[PDB]
Amino acid sequence: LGTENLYFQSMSDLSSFPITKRWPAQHSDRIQLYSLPTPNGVKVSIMLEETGLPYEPHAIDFGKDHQKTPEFLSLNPNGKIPAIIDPNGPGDKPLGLFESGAILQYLAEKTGQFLPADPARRWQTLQWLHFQMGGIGPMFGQLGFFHKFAGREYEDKRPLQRYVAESKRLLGVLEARLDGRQWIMDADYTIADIATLGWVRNLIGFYGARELVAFDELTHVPAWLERGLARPAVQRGLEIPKRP
Amino acid sequence: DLSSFPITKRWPAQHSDRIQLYSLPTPNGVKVSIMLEETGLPYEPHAIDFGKDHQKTPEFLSLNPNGKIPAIIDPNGPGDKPLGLFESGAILQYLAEKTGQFLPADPARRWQTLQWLHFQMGGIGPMFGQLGFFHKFAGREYEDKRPLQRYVAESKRLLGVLEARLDGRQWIMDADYTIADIATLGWVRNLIGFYGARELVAFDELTHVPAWLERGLARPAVQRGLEIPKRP
Numbered sequence: 001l002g003t004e005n006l007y008f009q010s011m012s013d014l015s016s017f018p019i020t021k022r023w024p025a026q027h028s029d030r031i032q033l034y035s036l037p038t039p040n041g042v043k044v045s046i047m048l049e050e051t052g053l054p055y056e057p058h059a060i061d062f063g064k065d066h067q068k069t070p071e072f073l074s075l076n077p078n079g080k081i082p083a084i085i086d087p088n089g090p091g092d093k094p095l096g097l098f099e100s101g102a103i104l105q106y107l108a109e110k111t112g113q114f115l116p117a118d119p120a121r122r123w124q125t126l127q128w129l130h131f132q133m134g135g136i137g138p139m140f141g142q143l144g145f146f147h148k149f150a151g152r153e154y155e156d157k158r159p160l161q162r163y164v165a166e167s168k169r170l171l172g173v174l175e176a177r178l179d180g181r182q183w184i185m186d187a188d189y190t191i192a193d194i195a196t197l198g199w200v201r202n203l204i205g206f207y208g209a210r211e212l213v214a215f216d217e218l219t220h221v222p223a224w225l226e227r228g229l230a231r232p233a234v235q236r237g238l239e240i241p242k243r244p
Numbered sequence: 245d246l247s248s249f250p251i252t253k254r255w256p257a258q259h260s261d262r263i264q265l266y267s268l269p270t271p272n273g274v275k276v277s278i279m280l281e282e283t284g285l286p287y288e289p290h291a292i293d294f295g296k297d298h299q300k301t302p303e304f305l306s307l308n309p310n311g312k313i314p315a316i317i318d319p320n321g322p323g324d325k326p327l328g329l330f331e332s333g334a335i336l337q338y339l340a341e342k343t344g345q346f347l348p349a350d351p352a353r354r355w356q357t358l359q360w361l362h363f364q365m366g367g368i369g370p371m372f373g374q375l376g377f378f379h380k381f382a383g384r385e386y387e388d389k390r391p392l393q394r395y396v397a398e399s400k401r402l403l404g405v406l407e408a409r410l411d412g413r414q415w416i417m418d419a420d421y422t423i424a425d426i427a428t429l430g431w432v433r434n435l436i437g438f439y440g441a442r443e444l445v446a447f448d449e450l451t452h453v454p455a456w457l458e459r460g461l462a463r464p465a466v467q468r469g470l471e472i473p474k475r476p
């Protein structure tokens with residue numbers, strides 16, 4: 001039975017995941033994070049920092065098309081960051097996950113942190129998560145393409161006007177929700193805030209759209225953003241992994 | 245005791261002991277109607293007339309302040325109290341929990357199913373919808389087609405991810421039909437039907453996504469849910 005015990009150990013380390021051939025794990029007993037500090041990547045590094053889970057971060061170099069490599073694609077077939085491998089997954093077996101949304105939900109369940117205990121407020125929290133994932137992320141990103149990236153050279157500005165109006169409309173929904181609340185779920189800081197902070201920060205910072213979306217006419221979203229940014233875990237998460 | 249929910253002032257419940265669905269048979273609305281049909285849960289659907297801006301009334305906004313469909317109220321929510329929910333994704337997860345169905349048994353496979361859910365919610369829906377805007381709706385009038393070309397390319401790329409995933413699988417999660425399939429089928433149907441983009445995205449060059457769609461559309465609950473509620 002020496003062979004059989006080696007077999008059971010093999011299913012608990014990470015050599016069965018082909019991504020590790022390109023980004024080797026130094027700490028096979030820690031969550032492997034494959035990411036960049038983009039608005040989507042930082043959701044997960046922030047969550048990991050807020051939970052105190054040990055992890056090992058790996059920058060994925062998009063300049064070299066490393067997200068298009070067979071090794072990266074074996075974990076996320078969509079070719080995007082973030083992705084993780086949790087060696088201590090359900091049933092003490094390693095689990096790979098892509099999609100920031102699935103990962104945030106996974107880490108909140110794993111740790112019993114950043115999701116209300118109350119069943120109704122838990123469901124409510126997931127609506128706001130889904131709101132960021134289907135609305136905020138994709139729409140702010142389209143604004144970015146037409147304002148900051150290659151879409152900015154297109155002469156017809158109606159696309160740009162469309163994503164500016166939708167980004168402002170989304171911010172207005174946040175603004176009514178944060179009127180009289182500390183966090184999206186009131187006194188509880190949750191994966192809904194962790195999903196959303198980076199995108200708002202990015203919109204008014206890197207994207208250079210602060211005036212474009214009339215951000216400084218808002219009251220409640222700016223104060224909420226300031227609250228999130230004062231959290232040490234947010235400050236840490238925002239710069240992990242270092243850019244390659 | 246739904247009286248506390250102001251939406252019922254504009255869309256009264258004839259059956260306050262049943263889930264109230266506020267929706268339209270759009271690619272996002274059909275996710276929830278299909279789920280409800282697949283589960284067999286009693287519910288009472290209400291068409292929300294966008295032609296009359298009804299989704300921007302105080303009554304609708306009290307349930308979804310984002311002013312979109314679908315939305316539900318379950319009178320027999322957690323703690324035998326009513327729960328309002330918006331977002332098709334959150335509703336699918338809630339209904340899967342309510343019924344113990346359309347998620348895999350295995351916890352690892354459950355989290356994997358939620359990946360494909362989120363890939364749909366963050367990728368398929370928003371991108372296919374932008375293609376809709378520039379090919380089917382008002383954006384079709386813009387002479388310069390670079391925006392359209394962008395969303396055609398992204399939608400094809402998304403279909404390419406599904407095509408590789410479905411290669412040798414019956415459903416997205418292998419032998420398990422789940423909320424991942426329920427979330428995605430309507431968007432793919434709509435893309436090649438109502439949006440008129442079947443040739444634009446080179447759909448008939450694919451093998452696995454077309455086969456998967458046919459298997460989904462052969463299900464009676466999908467056929468029922470695709471047309472509920474009836475358009476106002």
Ligand SMILES: N[C@@H](CCC(=O)N[C@@H](CS)C(=O)NCC(=O)O)C(=O)O
Pocket residue numbers: 038039040041062067079080081082098099100101366
């Ligand atoms: N939807 C995914 C990631 C989506 C996404 O677009 N991520 C970006 C960075 S913010 C990326 O990987 N971009 C690379 C590419 O599009 O090739 C999530 O929320 O986890």
Ligand SMILES: N[C@@H](CCC(=O)N[C@@H](CS)C(=O)NCC(=O)O)C(=O)O
Pocket residue numbers: 130131134135270271272273299311312313314330331332333365369
């Ligand atoms: N992320 C949402 C999106 C819902 C959505 O965009 N719904 C459309 C129908 S496909 C709508 O209600 N539009 C209303 C409006 O644009 O005001 C979900 O999946 O539920």
